[PDB]
Scaffold this active site. Structure first.
Site, PDB file in Angstrom:
ATOM      1  N   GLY A 115       0.892  -1.161   0.198  1.00  0.00           N
ATOM      2  CA  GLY A 115      -0.004  -0.052  -0.135  1.00  0.00           C
ATOM      3  C   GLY A 115       1.158   1.476  -0.011  1.00  0.00           C
ATOM      4  O   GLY A 115       0.807   2.121  -0.990  1.00  0.00           O
ATOM      5  N   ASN A 133      18.125  -9.258  -1.327  1.00  0.00           N
ATOM      6  CA  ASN A 133      18.769  -7.915  -1.098  1.00  0.00           C
ATOM      7  C   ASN A 133      20.219  -7.947  -1.625  1.00  0.00           C
ATOM      8  O   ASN A 133      20.564  -6.964  -2.331  1.00  0.00           O
ATOM      9  CB  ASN A 133      18.595  -7.284   0.248  1.00  0.00           C
ATOM     10  N   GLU A 189      23.883   7.064 -20.573  1.00  0.00           N
ATOM     11  CA  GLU A 189      23.790   5.969 -21.901  1.00  0.00           C
ATOM     12  C   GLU A 189      23.078   4.591 -21.321  1.00  0.00           C
ATOM     13  O   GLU A 189      23.643   3.788 -21.685  1.00  0.00           O
ATOM     14  CB  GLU A 189      25.199   5.769 -22.048  1.00  0.00           C
TER      15      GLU A 189
HETATM   16  N1  LIG Z   1      12.611  -9.144  -2.624  1.00  0.00           N
HETATM   17  C1  LIG Z   1      11.951  -8.351  -1.269  1.00  0.00           C
HETATM   18  N2  LIG Z   1      10.838  -7.975  -1.560  1.00  0.00           N
HETATM   19  C2  LIG Z   1      10.180  -7.526  -0.322  1.00  0.00           C
HETATM   20  C3  LIG Z   1      10.945  -7.187   0.854  1.00  0.00           C
HETATM   21  N3  LIG Z   1       9.941  -6.928   1.863  1.00  0.00           N
HETATM   22  C4  LIG Z   1       8.791  -6.930   1.074  1.00  0.00           C
HETATM   23  N4  LIG Z   1       8.779  -7.431   0.106  1.00  0.00           N
HETATM   24  C5  LIG Z   1       7.732  -7.603  -0.848  1.00  0.00           C
HETATM   25  O1  LIG Z   1       6.813  -6.398  -0.525  1.00  0.00           O
HETATM   26  C6  LIG Z   1       5.448  -6.985  -0.624  1.00  0.00           C
HETATM   27  C7  LIG Z   1       4.443  -6.171   0.325  1.00  0.00           C
HETATM   28  O2  LIG Z   1       4.990  -4.827   0.600  1.00  0.00           O
HETATM   29  P1  LIG Z   1       5.831  -4.327   1.808  1.00  0.00           P
HETATM   30  O3  LIG Z   1       7.150  -3.588   1.318  1.00  0.00           O
HETATM   31  O4  LIG Z   1       6.377  -5.577   2.566  1.00  0.00           O
HETATM   32  O5  LIG Z   1       5.029  -3.254   2.596  1.00  0.00           O
HETATM   33  P2  LIG Z   1       4.729  -1.762   2.155  1.00  0.00           P
HETATM   34  O6  LIG Z   1       5.360  -1.543   1.022  1.00  0.00           O
HETATM   35  O7  LIG Z   1       5.555  -0.923   3.286  1.00  0.00           O
HETATM   36  O8  LIG Z   1       3.301  -1.592   2.440  1.00  0.00           O
HETATM   37  P3  LIG Z   1       2.394  -1.726   3.801  1.00  0.00           P
HETATM   38  O9  LIG Z   1       2.386  -3.069   4.095  1.00  0.00           O
HETATM   39  O10 LIG Z   1       0.996  -1.163   3.544  1.00  0.00           O
HETATM   40  O11 LIG Z   1       3.246  -0.800   4.976  1.00  0.00           O
HETATM   41  C8  LIG Z   1       5.672  -8.398  -0.340  1.00  0.00           C
HETATM   42  O12 LIG Z   1       4.739  -8.895  -0.928  1.00  0.00           O
HETATM   43  C9  LIG Z   1       6.978  -8.750  -0.605  1.00  0.00           C
HETATM   44  O13 LIG Z   1       7.132  -9.554  -1.696  1.00  0.00           O
HETATM   45  C10 LIG Z   1      12.386  -7.646   0.820  1.00  0.00           C
HETATM   46  O14 LIG Z   1      13.025  -7.328   1.820  1.00  0.00           O
HETATM   47  N5  LIG Z   1      12.906  -8.044  -0.428  1.00  0.00           N
END
Ligand SMILES: Nc1nc2c(ncn2[C@@H]2O[C@H](COP(=O)(O)OP(=O)(O)OP(=O)(O)O)[C@@H](O)[C@H]2O)c(=O)[nH]1
Ligand SMILES: Nc1nc2c(ncn2[C@@H]2O[C@H](COP(=O)(O)OP(=O)(O)OP(=O)(O)O)[C@@H](O)[C@H]2O)c(=O)[nH]1
Ligand SMILES: Nc1nc2c(ncn2[C@@H]2O[C@H](COP(=O)(O)OP(=O)(O)O)[C@@H](O)[C@H]2O)c(=O)[nH]1
Ligand SMILES: [Mg+2]
Ligand SMILES: [Mg+2]
Lengths: 430, 200, 434, 48, 57, 71, 439, 71
Positions: free
Chosen positions: G144, G228, G254
């Site tokens: 979100g 990561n 580029e």
């Molecule tokens: N590759 C990777 N994906 C991540 C990581 N953390 C969260 N995600 C992805 O982010 C998705 C959910 O969004 P989040 O970033 O966790 O949460 P947010 O963007 O802060 O949104 P809110 O939950 O509303 O706070 C998950 O389905 C994961 O696939 C991470 O450390 N590495």
């Protein structure tokens, strides 16, 4: 990774399973407390075929024990190696079977099989790659033959691709151990012929003969008889757990032994078997093993195979031996006895070799053969059944649960046409 | 395999002969006396005990390789005190031929020809002189550093406190060399030619 | 600059590969660890490859559907040698079913091997061709073997493919359904293999019993003999010699027609050291023993047929003037008769490296050896024997439900018989004198 | 695109927790292991 | 000369083998251990904090 | 492949060794050491035969001890 | 004198920025406290760190980054750990209430009280720089606050600055594996938002990198830290040419001049080589030829997409280590020779190659191996339509009956947004199909 | 950006080294250091492989210990 789960039912099924798990545990060096104490590494690589793992490094068998009366499982829990089994794998009722196929198949097992089907379902999905199932039960009893066959049908409806192997103790009327055993025997075979991939019949009269004429021991007991079955039971899957020159599993043995789908009834035998006063004169060589292996009196069934033609035979050797003699002896025995083998298939014997012999022995062998002489026990059971069913003796016990005589009529024919079609291949010529 | 009863005894015997062919096949510089010298480095405290990992490293560094189940077989048989450490001294005590009786004749007679003083102990310098004469015809009697320069031909063995070569170690050094060569005739050929004495 | 890539599929292929790769490592000096012992001739480039950081890895791939035999390679003395991801293993065996290993569980694994093959091929610069090992009388041996050769034909094409199959013996064998998957395999490899060699087991049993003086032979004994044939065949690709012959200079001198490429091999001297103390092991006699029908490595009698082409290789201390004299004697003897339209039918190559001996082996070390690859019309008898056994059992439609139920149509057998049947007709027509 | 699947597959309706008469029974040959009868033959090409 | 025995290596049951004692926290040397940071530089639980930046919440 | 050796036995000679050979009077194909070479090769073969016989006998004894123990 | 500003939003953005910045600090030799180790007393030259860091006039270096979130746990964890002395105290912007997987919450209600502070900090970072190349933004798109704040920031930056470049390393949901149950909605909305406001977009779904870790790194139970680390290695390989000497140099500008055939088409997928565990790392020789052959392997694509189903438009590869241009040219010739890889009709030459000399750095506790050669790929192809096509079906299934729509409607978003977002997605799909066809 | 090394291995030579090079006969691109450099690179790689293997083995043992304690 091609592991098999073990399910047994009935008094005979539980007693046989009790001795079998003791034999396997000694093979893999498992103590009664479930802690591995092996000395080599070959005894641990393939331990997941029969054993699970828990906290602390202990192994628990993936076995399931079922009964309609906890009386039989009562004795197995207090015996040696009784703590290996999971407490949750015991499923039981509180009424009993009544030596009645109808009770064990329609009014008691039907309402009880919901719980056990959950247990086996949990085991089946947990394992990596399920290889098949094996069954140990007696056709002469109520809960073993009745609820056992219902579980066979139910399992097949959910796993139509996995293999299904059974060990059936079919009744020989000489041990008239149950006056109503012809009813259960003919009804179980009819249910068994449609689902079970492989069947291995076992007779108590044959086992008494082995303990009396071969082992020459004065006082046999079910402990000794159950061990003979257990020794053969491990031999069929020994090559799956240990390395060998040629590898062979349950599927490979089936593929090389069943010409037609309805013909899946075999007989088993084990060698060497020698008395305490007679092994001082015998020599341990491959020709001696194949001499006793094909002996008629050594079979574990009342059917004598010299009255019929071997449709196909299978041999599984254990220990370090030369491949040439294994292939040479099978060819030699096949030529000198050309009248005992069907002619329209050349070289109808399969061989397999495993490098790990049983503990205390250097060589061994297990014989599985599909012979047309097994029709003689079906004939004897059928003629006894039609004698009793003509006068409708003991019928009200079975009909009291809604069972109708039409199912009895169909059970006769499917057994009847089984005998008729299984006999003409003895007279078939090329 | 299935080392339950006498299976353990027969499984080790396969390794006893398998090690012998490997040492015999190379026929060259690899000597069994290098194994005792190479294990002392790993023993550290002169305990006489080595674990499986260090035992495997020494054998593999020598160039001898076996299977994982094979290494477990050696550990079970040769762990007398049940502490999880193999006895390399016990391992080297085995897989060592005593020496044949006919080989004893050449070993003693070669020693006796050099040992003309009957004391049974031979000055190491005397070995160096005769070993170089049989190799070059222009060595000449006089040398600038005949002791140290020619002494590299000797001192592979060990001496007693007196510095004289004990006959007991004289045969001990030659018997271990008699493992890499399984051809008794070639053992004859090497000794008679390299020492210039032939009599049988 | 010149390399070959070996393909091992099935228990027979892998277990033979253990013997072959034992010899190659010891012949070039490679340790089981993969490192060079000697301080130290790029003769290892044909079989091994410099992986840079020390060791050398072979250009081989092992294929199987049961991991039992593969685990030994990952546990045996050569665990550190082979690359971890070039030993491909499945989970379920084909269980002596050609259909299972060709239609159901063939697609799931044939893709991994193709990916591995491409990377090995991209490493090589002047890749001569492929060598394949398979057991015909097995499930994954015949199943995946047909699938790979069918797929390899369109992936590469003009690159040569050589095969060393193992047909069942005339009477002695292990399985009972082996005629079915033997017919179907031949029905495939006929149109997808450049050169095929028959390697039935019963002939090797007789050779070991008669010559090596062994009363209890084992598959290890057979595999060592077969590895000798491979080494001598490819010896000229890496060792200097007076007359050099390559892989490309076989089919240019040994297959008269594309349809006829089935051959039977021989090797000499095959003698134990006990009775090698008496015979003189001359050049003239070892080539005479190579033509003896009892010494042939396939259970066929050339005295019932004509020789079309004859490729034979010497290694050791042979002299070309000695070879020429022996060939003249062979042409003199009447019981060896060549086809009419081949006035000259010998291709001879000479290598200088003497054969090497595996420690713990049974062959005697000698300065002379000759390997024989012969193309003859007598090979039509093995197909006739296999035809009789298949037709005999297929008359009553036995074991066929296990083939129909895996997606394989029942019409495979009818065309497989027709494909085989035309083969004998071609082989008999070639040998007719004009 | 398709990924046709053979022996085992990976999708089922009620494999894990499925469970929620005398008149009906297995008659003669509805079982998989019986019925020694075989389908009809087709020509096939193999030439492709 | 002797019958068949069941227990190998003479493994006494834990029932009678000594008694319970305060090792309930055997695993909990890393049980309050954080891995969002952590597993990045250290393998042990973080020390108590002494300094915080503005807006630490 | 290559041809660096004239024969398996003799390598290419030194450039100063071939002093003449413009007129066909020396060929280095007449050997003159053939009999001695064969005589030496005989003993080299015999040594290998004896070694391998000894190895086979040792293997046979090791195999016999197997049954000796199992009995 | 060349700088790049990193923007991190959401939990995924922060947890990838952590690895990126630990890698950058170790690469440039800065201790977590923010200063070089005291052992090396020779003064100081270098100045290559100026792209990522900035001298504060008294000692330590301060990164040119900013962290954003509405849920304070991750930011508090950042400011509690061993890196608390490195980052500027008030460039770690934290809110009070998270958007809770709601695009409307993260775009119309809560994000507007933090976007002002964010842009103030962005100005405070930008005015310091003099040669700003552009902005790098990391965001998890199926979240979100992530998607909402990313959309709002890109919208406002597109007018605050204009022609400055922006690069987005988004993380789209995997084809079947996912954490939330409502992510198609905000995924589609964010796709609409970033279609018209991003110069280059890189696909970074999680299933592909899970497969890479399982198959290659031989890790049976991977965690987000490994993901990561791999993404940070990709970013480092991308930006290495800006701060180290090289035989052939490529700037940030580029990429959008040799990879973007048309302004609408800027979606592309990446790959990396070699990724091999130490048990088999250099038991294969890892020459330049085979590493560039493995860079083309479909299973090694960092997005779950197969290039065999489409045609290549352009390629961009960056080598670092001890590579040689002649070997690179030979590898290019071999790749062009291979038939299973084919290029579009109107692109006869489709490779731009850059060479850097600084070898990749290794982080303690990592999984990769120390290598002397490495290749990083950024490729644009018509096969990228797969992810849009399979994402389309998921949205329609649950939107045909207005599931979860009340959550989004009640937060101030018009109901008609979904249809227009789908229409823009469909128009994007049509573009990739029409471009790839031959004339 | 910067181009200070004509290759990753060798830097720009001292001005006294290039005494001629007006007539193209000495090119300095012919290596003469290739073989030894590659050989040395081999061991420098092997040491890194050994170090990483040892580190990962230590990590695996540390992982096992905590499960052993939880039991
Ligand atoms: N590759 C990777 N994906 C991540 C990581 N953390 C969260 N995600 C992805 O982010 C998705 C959910 O969004 P989040 O970033 O966790 O949460 P947010 O963007 O802060 O949104 P809110 O939950 O509303 O706070 C998950 O389905 C994961 O696939 C991470 O450390 N590495
Ligand atoms: N000559 C020789 N033949 C072998 C050897 N091992 C297996 N075979 C042949 O292989 C045939 C049976 O097949 P298997 O080797 O058991 O296995 P497979 O060929 O891979 O077929 P599957 O069992 O389905 O995997 C036998 O008839 C043997 O002739 C060997 O070591 N030497
Ligand atoms: N081999 C063997 N047969 C047994 C054993 N116990 C019972 N039986 C046979 O099983 C038959 C009776 O089975 P029963 O106890 O009624 O089976 P249940 O009704 O399923 O419990 C008798 O004919 C016995 O011969 C045993 O321990 N071993
Ligand atoms: Mg097999
Ligand atoms: Mg969040």
């Amino acid at each position: 990774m091609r592991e098999i789960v073990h399910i047994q039912g009935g008094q005979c099924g539980n007693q046989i399973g009790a001795k079998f798990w003791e034999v396997i545990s000694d093979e893999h060096g498992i103590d009664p407390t479930g802690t591995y104490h092996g000395d080599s590494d070959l005894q641990l690589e393939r331990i997941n075929v029969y054993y699970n793992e828990a906290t602390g490094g202990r192994y628990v068998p993936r076995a399931i024990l079922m009964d309609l009366e906890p009386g039989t499982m009562d004795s197995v829990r207090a015996g040696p190696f009784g703590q290996l089994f999971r407490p949750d794998n015991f499923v039981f009722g509180q009424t009993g079977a009544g030596n009645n196929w109808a009770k064990g198949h329609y009014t008691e097992g039907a309402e009880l099989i919901d719980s056990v089907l959950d247990v086996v379902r949990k085991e089946a999905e947990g394992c990596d790659c399920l290889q098949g199932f094996q069954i140990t039960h007696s056709l002469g009893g109520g809960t073993g033959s009745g609820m056992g066959t219902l579980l066979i049908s139910k399992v097949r409806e959910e796993y139509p691709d996995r293999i299904m192997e059974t060990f059936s103790v079919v009744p020989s009327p000489k041990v008239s151990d149950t006056v109503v055993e012809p009813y259960n025997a003919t009804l179980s075979v009819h249910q068994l012929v449609e689902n079970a991939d492989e069947c291995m019949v076992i007779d108590n009269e044959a086992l008494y003969d082995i303990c009396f004429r071969t082992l020459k021991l004065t006082t046999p007991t079910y402990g000794d008889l159950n061990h003979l079955v257990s020794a053969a039971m491990s031999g069929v899957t020994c090559c799956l757990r240990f390395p060998g020159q040629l590898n062979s599993d349950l599927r490979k043995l089936a593929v090389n032994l069943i010409p037609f789908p309805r013909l899946h009834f075999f007989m088993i035998g084990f060698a060497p078997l020698t008395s305490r006063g007679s092994q001082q004169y015998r020599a341990l060589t491959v020709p001696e093993l194949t001499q006793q292996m094909f002996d008629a009196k050594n079979m574990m069934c009342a059917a004598d195979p010299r009255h019929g033609r071997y449709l196909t035979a299978s041999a599984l050797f254990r220990g370090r031996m030369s491949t040439k003699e294994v292939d040479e002896q099978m060819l030699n025995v096949q030529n000198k006895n050309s009248s005992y083998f069907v002619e329209w298939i050349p070289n109808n014997i399969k061989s397999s070799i495993c490098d790990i012999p049983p503990k205390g022995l250097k060589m061994a062998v297990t014989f599985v053969g599909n012979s047309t002489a097994i029709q003689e026990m079906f004939k004897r059971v059928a003629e006894q059944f039609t004698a009793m069913f003509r006068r409708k003796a003991f019928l009200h016990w079975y009909t009291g649960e809604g069972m109708d005589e039409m199912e009895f009529t169909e059970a006769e024919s499917n057994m009847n046409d089984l005998v008729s079609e299984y006999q003409q291949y003895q007279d078939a010529t090329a | 395999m299935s080392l339950y009863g006498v299976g353990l005894n027969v499984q080790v015997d396969r390794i006893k002969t398998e090690f012998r062919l490997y040492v015999s096949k190379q026929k060259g510089g690899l000597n069994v006396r290098n194994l005792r010298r190479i294990f002392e480095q790993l023993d550290y405290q002169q305990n006489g005990q080595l674990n499986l990992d260090d035992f495997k490293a020494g054998l593999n560094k020598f160039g001898f390789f076996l299977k994982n189940v094979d290494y477990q077989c050696l550990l079970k048989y040769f762990d007398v005190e049940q502490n999880g450490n193999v006895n390399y001294l016990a391992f080297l005590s085995c897989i060592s031929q005593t020496l044949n009786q006919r080989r004893a004749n050449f070993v003693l007679k070669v020693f006796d020809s050099i040992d003309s003083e009957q004391k049974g102990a031979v000055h190491p310098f005397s070995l160096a002189e005769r070993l170089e004469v049989v190799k070059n015809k222009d060595y000449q009697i006089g040398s600038k550093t005949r002791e140290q320069l020619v002494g590299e031909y000797v001192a592979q063995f060990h001496k007693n406190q007196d510095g004289l070569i004990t006959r007991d170690e004289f045969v001990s050094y030659y018997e271990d060399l008699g493992l890499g060569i399984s051809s008794d005739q070639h053992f004859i050929e090497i000794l008679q030619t390299q020492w210039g004495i032939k009599e049988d | 600059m010149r390399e070959v890539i070996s393909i091992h599929v099935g228990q027979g292929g892998i277990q033979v590969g253990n013997a072959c790769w034992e010899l190659f490592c010891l012949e070039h000096g490679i340790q089981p660890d993969g490192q060079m012992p000697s301080d130290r001739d790029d003769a290892f480039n044909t079989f091994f490859s410099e992986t840079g950081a020390g060791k050398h890895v072979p250009r081989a791939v092992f294929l199987d559907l049961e991991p039992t035999v593969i685990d030994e390679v990952r546990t045996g003395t050569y665990r550190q040698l082979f690359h971890p991801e070039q030993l491909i293993s499945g989970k379920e065996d084909a269980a002596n079913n050609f259909a299972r290993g060709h239609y159901t569980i063939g697609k799931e694994i044939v893709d991994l091997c193709l990916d591995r093959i491409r990377k090995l091929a991209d490493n090589c610069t002047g890749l001569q061709g492929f060598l394949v090992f398979n057991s015909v009388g097995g499930g994954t041996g015949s199943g995946l073997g047909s699938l790979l050769l069918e797929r390899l034909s369109v992936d590469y094409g003009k690159k040569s493919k050589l095969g060393f199959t193992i047909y069942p013996s005339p009477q002695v064998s292990t399985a009972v359904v082996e005629p079915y998957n033997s017919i179907l395999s031949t029905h495939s490899l006929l149109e997808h293999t450049d050169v095929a060699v028959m390697l039935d087991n019963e002939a090797i049993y007789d050779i070991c019993r008669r010559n090596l003086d062994i009363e209890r032979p084992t598959y290890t004994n057979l595999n060592r003999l077969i590895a000798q044939v491979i080494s001598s065949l490819t010896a000229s690709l890496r060792f200097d010699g007076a007359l050099n012959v390559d892989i490309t200079e076989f089919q240019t001198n040994l297959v008269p027609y594309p349809r006829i490429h089935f051959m039977l091999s021989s090797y000499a001297p095959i003698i134990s050291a006990e009775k090698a103390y008496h015979e003189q092991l001359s050049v003239a006699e070892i080539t005479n023993s190579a033509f003896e029908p009892a010494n042939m490595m396939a259970k066929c009698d050339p005295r019932h047929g004509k020789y079309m082409a004859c490729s034979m290789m010497y290694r050791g201390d042979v002299v070309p003037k000695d070879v020429n004299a022996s060939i003249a004697t062979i042409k003199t003897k009447r019981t060896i008769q060549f086809v009419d339209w081949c006035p000259t039918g010998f291709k001879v190559g000479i290598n200088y490296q003497p054969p090497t001996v595996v420690p713990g082996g049974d062959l005697a070390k000698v300065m002379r050896a000759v390997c024989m690859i012969s193309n003859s019309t007598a090979i039509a008898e093995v197909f006739s024997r296999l035809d009789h056994k298949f037709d005999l059992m297929y008359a009553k439609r036995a074991f066929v439900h296990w083939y129909v139920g895996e997606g394989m149509e029942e019409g495979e057998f009818s065309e497989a018989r027709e494909d085989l049947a035309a083969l004998e007709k071609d082989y008999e027509e070639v040998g007719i004198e004009t | 695109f398709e990924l046709s699947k053979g022996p085992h597959s990976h999708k089922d309706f009620c494999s894990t927790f499925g469970r929620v008469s005398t008149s009906d029974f297995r008659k003669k040959n509805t079982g998989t292991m019986g019925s020694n009868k075989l389908p009809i033959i087709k020509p096939f090409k193999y030439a492709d | 000369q002797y019958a068949y025995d069941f227990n190998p290596a003479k493994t006494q049951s834990l029932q009678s083998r000594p008694i319970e004692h305060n090792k309930f926290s055997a695993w909990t040397g890393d049980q309050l251990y954080r891995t969002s940071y952590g597993t990045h530089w250290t393998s042990k639980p973080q020390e108590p904090k002494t300094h915080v930046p503005p807006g630490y919440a | 492949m290559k041809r660096v050796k004239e024969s398996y036995f003799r390598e290419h000679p030194h450039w100063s060794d071939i002093n003449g050979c413009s007129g066909a009077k020396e060929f280095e194909g007449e050997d003159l050491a053939y009999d001695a070479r064969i005589k030496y090769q005989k003993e080299t073969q015999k040594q290998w035969i004896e070694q391998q016989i000894r190895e086979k006998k040792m293997r046979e004894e090791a195999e016999r001890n197997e049954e000796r123990a199992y009995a």
